[PDB]
Design a protein around this ligand. Structure first.
Ligand SMILES: CC(=O)N[C@H]1[C@H]([C@H](O)[C@H](O)CNNN)OC(C(=O)O)=C[C@@H]1O
Ligand SMILES: CC(=O)N[C@H]1[C@H]([C@H](O)[C@H](O)CNNN)OC(C(=O)O)=C[C@@H]1O
Ligand SMILES: [Cl-]
Ligand SMILES: [Cl-]
Lengths: 471, 470
């Protein structure tokens, strides 16, 4: 009814690197593809377990429904700053992925955060730096030069232009070719490599991008064996007021019914400049209506939301309990979209959209039957014996421990009745990602430690309806 | 050398309205048009002198270089909320104008602030309310309905649509036809007038716009006799992060030389959601490269500005002395644009743009030779006997009193040499607007009170080069 765990990404022990030189794995994502393939994604956290540093976006493929797994495939790994004083924070950062496959074109997407060198979201400045500039209808990323106020631009072929629009001898590797694309951002003057635009300290080149939070996307057209170079989708979705914008990690969905069928939905969340992490974390989705070519930001669940008699907006809010952060997204048979959002109420918070994720209904439903200890969750739509269900997994608590797989029946109004709460993993348990495997079976890739393992080891289990409906 | 003052807009006395029922006039703007006409614009502040209330945008015309002035022409005056608890703050607001003429099309522009019913910039909400929505490639103004979260839209012919996109029986007067366009925003259900979308309190209709700061524009193609209906240019220039966005009042310019010759520049300034009026007031300009059809926002002077070792941005700053507010804009013969900005340093602050107002150079120059007591100023380019000068007028201090007309020589390197500091008006002196009249003559329209006059009476004077070099 519930298989034993198979380890997919194994962290080191007792604060040490593993045999591959990796201290830590985190942030699982699991995807079943059109070919029946399982794709397991993770943060490869080389130097330590914290939310920054030298981190690669990696996947593994299984062609036998989770029995055996191939080699690690690295989607993206930016090279570290070799001259940084502190290697722990000495690398441009990728962190947190969402996986999803377009069911029509089969293109598989990995969408993830990017920061230049630093402590990621924990090192973002109080002051905004413009990251892009529109010129003659074209959007270019800005470079800043030491001692100059003006905005240089990275234009066609990675050629660097002056603030007044003159071409220079400098160029940016905007079409990386090295393994893991570790050359992306490399700054050249003609033949000579001088440094990297993603470096922030002890720089050897004169140029850096704006210190900000970024969103990147890589894709695969061959069942996840090979991946495109990173695409910077930030300017398509990030508002001027947005401070942080990152994914709510795990697995996204494609709407399968209603007038927006074919729309890809990716959970995200933002902070604003008023309260940042302290009172503005706000769930929403970005979506694509053209098979991943262009992206749009939906509205926040918190936009024009009523809280204690007064309205808030995600761009201006400062309210700790009204926050909603990482989320997981589900479409019902009636066309409604449900968003299960990590929050600070201690229990499950759910938003409902009726227009395919663009806007959200006035009331955030809370379900006290399912505990939320402030940690990522995942959820999937499912059918069984003619009825509609949602399967949701997260920590049962009180800490990030005692994993649960909860089961809800989908009622007529689109409301949820919680039926079952099944423990799946004693001990530590955190981020996780669910997928239907077919033939009444289900998959889960999740964070856990035993035997002194560094946080975390990412493990895989299978289960069926006897596990979901034990009494 | 300096004429006696002629009063163009006269306030009431001792807190009373004048014979027209107007307590107060404020915010002068003065324009010499292609036909030699002087256009003098003002806030007509009926109920009081405060920065809100029932305020009409009005002008007067002079065809004899300021000797005589015609009747008042009202550009725009929105109707009050008849059910407001306090009429003092009971009206949608227009406030602060900039005048400018396109020398090629001869079209005259008036650009000014708009707020729905309330205390204007001192009455903005704490939370953002989305004002616009793009639908099928079109941008529509949003309406909010009591008890509903969703965004209604005002679409074609002013027809109101639901959040889920169905037309309703409700409509907005989007083509006002009453004098002064006082019907703009009127909300109808079929034939029945129900209220106004700009009303915020004690409403009789179900709909209102977002409580926000707006930017409107009206134009005249007949030398200022008649004016178009107000055009809402806000969504062209207002970013998502901007809280307040308004004009730096007075008279804008058209670049007369360089690669951007023909560009219209309108001084504006913003606040952000971090510190608002406390530390984020940031000067910039908006510009049009197509004779006023479309507007674009240049960058703020404060964007990527170095302050105390750290860079700031107008959207995130919280720094009182680093603020810059209402400003006046001049182009030099070398093409550089100078922006003289109201501020809190006690002295004159000047920014320089080399790309026609889009971006600003690293150092804001200060001139302690010129006092700035935190009040609007005006400045104009002028040539005299082969040389380049800038004339700048403002309060000499210590309060908004002791009006001064300063004269600077523009040196070759683009630096300014202050030669003269000429008193022009003892007693109260505040906002003012300068224009070249031709033949070594100059005009100034300015705020001043005497004899118990309410703040302010807007008066006009002429002066020449014997005055500038007294
Ligand atoms: C980009 C990033 O930093 N992602 C972090 C995420 C984030 O820091 C919080 O959502 C911020 N909110 N702080 N509570 O948190 C966690 C976490 O296990 O708790 C893991 C992610 O890798
Ligand atoms: C739209 C508006 O309110 N315009 C006001 C302007 C504004 O209030 C401040 O520049 C902002 N706050 N100033 N710190 O100030 C003044 C003033 O005489 O001082 C007159 C204008 O009519
Ligand atoms: Cl470098
Ligand atoms: Cl009303």
């Amino acid at each position: 009814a519930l298989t034993e765990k198979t380890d997919i990404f194994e962290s080191g022990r007792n604060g040490n690197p593993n045999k591959d030189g990796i201290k830590s794995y985190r942030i699982p994502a699991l995807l079943k593809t059109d070919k029946g393939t399982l794709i397991a994604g993770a943060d490869e956290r080389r130097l330590h377990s914290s939310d920054w540093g030298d981190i690669g976006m990696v996947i593994r493929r299984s062609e036998d429904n989770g029995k055996t797994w191939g080699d690690r495939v690295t989607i993206t790994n930016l090279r570290d700053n070799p001259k940084a004083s502190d290697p722990s924070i000495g690398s441009p950062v990728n962190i947190d992925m969402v996986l999803v496959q377009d069911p029509e074109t089969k293109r598989i997407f990995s969408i993830y955060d990017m920061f230049p060198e630093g402590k990621g979201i924990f090192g973002m400045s109080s002051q905004k730096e413009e990251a892009y500039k529109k010129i003659d209808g074209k959007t270019y990323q800005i470079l800043y030069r030491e001692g100059e106020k003006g905005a240089y631009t990275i234009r066609e072929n990675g050629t660097v232009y002056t603030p007044d629009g003159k071409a220079t001898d400098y160029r940016v590797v905007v079409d990386p070719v090295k393994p893991a694309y570790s050359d992306k951002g490399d700054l050249y003057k003609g033949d000579q490599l001088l440094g990297n635009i993603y470096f922030t300290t002890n720089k050897t080149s004169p140029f850096r991008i704006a210190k900000d939070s970024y969103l990147w996307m890589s894709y695969s057209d061959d069942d996840g064996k090979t991946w495109s170079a990173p695409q910077d989708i930030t300017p398509m979705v990030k508002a001027d007021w947005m401070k942080f914008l990152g994914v709510g990690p795990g697995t996204g969905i494609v709407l399968r019914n209603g007038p927006h069928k074919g729309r890809i939905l990716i959970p995200v969340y933002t902070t604003n400049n008023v309260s940042h992490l302290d009172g503005s974390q706000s769930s929403r989705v970005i979506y694509s209506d053209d098979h991943g070519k262009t992206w749009h930001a939906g509205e926040a669940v918190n936009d024009n939301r009523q809280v204690d008699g007064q309205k808030i907006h995600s761009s201006t809010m400062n309210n700790r309990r009204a926050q909603n952060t990482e989320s997981t997204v589900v479409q019902l048979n009636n066309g409604d979209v449900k968003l299960f959002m990590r929050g600070l109420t201690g229990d499950l918070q759910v938003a409902t959209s009726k227009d395919g994720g663009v806007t959200w209904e006035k009331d955030i439903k809370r379900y006290p039957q399912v505990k939320d200890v402030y940690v990522q969750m995942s959820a999937i739509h499912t059918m069984h014996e003619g009825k509609e269900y949602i399967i949701l997994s997260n920590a049962g608590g009180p800490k990030r421990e005692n994993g649960m797989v909860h089961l809800a029946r989908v009622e007529e109004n689109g409301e949820l009745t919680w039926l079952k709460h099944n423990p799946i993993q004693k001990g530590e348990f955190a981020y996780n990602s669910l997928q239907e495997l077919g033939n009444g079976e289900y998959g889960i890739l999740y964070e856990h430690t035993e035997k002194g393992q560094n946080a975390y080891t990412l493990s895989f289990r299978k289960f069926n309806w006897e596990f979901l409906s034990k009494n």
